[PDB]
Amino acid sequence: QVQLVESGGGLVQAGGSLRLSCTASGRTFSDYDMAWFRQAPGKERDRVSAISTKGGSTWYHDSVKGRFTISRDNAKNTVYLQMNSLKPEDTAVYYCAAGAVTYYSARYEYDYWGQGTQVTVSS
């Protein structure tokens, strides 16, 4: 059994902060690139942040750059998403993901996923 266990969620006031986390169990995930996806009401689940195996390289969706920080603690098989200056626009179910796979150029699928957690930002 190899699990990617998600922790977090909640209601946050506009301008506020929230940290989400995922801890993998059953194998090292230090092998894998990781990401955070979000799925806003009526939309598709889309990749919002990505990190390399040792965190030397990060990627951010344009709407979260400067405000969100993806980091990972490999000694703990754990990944984080630190969200600052939250806007109502960031209301979504957030999922962590690990083990990047690409079939079509620049389209990433993931081997393991968190169960998802709701993050709501009030106006």
CATH of the domain at 78: 2.60.40.10
Q: Which residues contact 86 (CB under 8 A, 6 or more apart)?
A: 12, 13, 14, 15, 16, 17, 18, 67, 119, 121
How many domains, the chain?
Answer: 1
Provide the domain limits for residue 102.
1-123
Resolution (A): 2.1
The Cα–Cα gap between 86 and 51 comes to 21
Radius of gyration of the chain (CA): 14
Using CB atoms within 10 Å of the CB of residue 121, give its burial: 0 to 12 exposed, 13 to 18 middle, 19+ buried: buried
The H or E element containing residue 51 is: strand 46-51
